[PDB]
Design a protein around this ligand. Sequence first.
Ligand SMILES: CCS(=O)(=O)c1ccc([C@@H](NC(=O)Cc2ccccc2)C(=O)Nc2ccc(C(O)(C(F)(F)F)C(F)(F)F)cc2)cc1
Ligand code: NA
Lengths: 12, 252
Amino acid sequence: KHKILHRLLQDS
Amino acid sequence: ENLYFQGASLTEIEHLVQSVCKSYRETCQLRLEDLLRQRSNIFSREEVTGYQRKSMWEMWERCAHHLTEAIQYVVEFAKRLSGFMELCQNDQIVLLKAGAMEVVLVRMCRAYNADNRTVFFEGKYGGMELFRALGCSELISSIFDFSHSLSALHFSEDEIALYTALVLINAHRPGLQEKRKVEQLQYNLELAFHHHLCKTHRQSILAKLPPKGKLRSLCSQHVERLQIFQHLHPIVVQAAFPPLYKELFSGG
Ligand SMILES: CCS(=O)(=O)c1ccc([C@@H](NC(=O)Cc2ccccc2)C(=O)Nc2ccc(C(O)(C(F)(F)F)C(F)(F)F)cc2)cc1
Ligand code: NA
């Protein structure tokens, strides 16, 4: 259930 | 939300060419000059044999890590692309899930030397025989053929920037909630790419670009071969494949 994209997208 | 979600003037399209080229330059991962200079650094017969002697699972893990590193640069490219961060999160994820690997496959032609059919991998150039331990010869040969065909176009860095922005912003991807917003952004990016080709007298490449079905076939083959490998070494995938790679290609 890995969800990394959300993290990369929100990391500013 | 963004100027490029509506009709853009010629001056706005000129600004877009510059913005896309800048976004690409800042996220290209490796410099073209660095890849070209390293063409003479080729794996020896001894080094090729060593890669061939690696286990199937250790070679899959190394390639999944290298692909994930390339994908991370594509996610940054997407974030820097005019309009992308103004799309909803559902759509940003739909576009990256469908398009990040396609962009890496296009970018890979920069690292492919058509003169001796080699690719830059782990510090030197090697032929498709370097990857024999993976047990997916058809997929590797298909990726090398694709890189060979793109190499024959002699793309400039600005052409790759504009072509990859379009590979990513595809309003036909299933699952987009704001399809009309993506359609307009895609239209403006198409105008930017075609404007650049017109200005540089390179419109002749348009009929030579690969059909969308070609990139789709490559991505489909990659997911199919990963499924075969995962059935053989399930714990290698669970324990040692990168989480981002599993999110994109094996449903998490
Ligand atoms: C894609 C962006 S760019 O053109 O800037 C760019 C090209 C090549 C690499 C290359 N850098 C490494 O190896 C990392 C490094 C370098 C030096 C020492 C140790 C480590 C790289 O990652 N190659 C590479 C080739 C081929 C593959 C396949 O997975 C595929 F399927 F894509 F072709 C493989 F199957 F052939 F393995 C997977 C990966 C990185 C970036
Ligand atoms: Na090339």
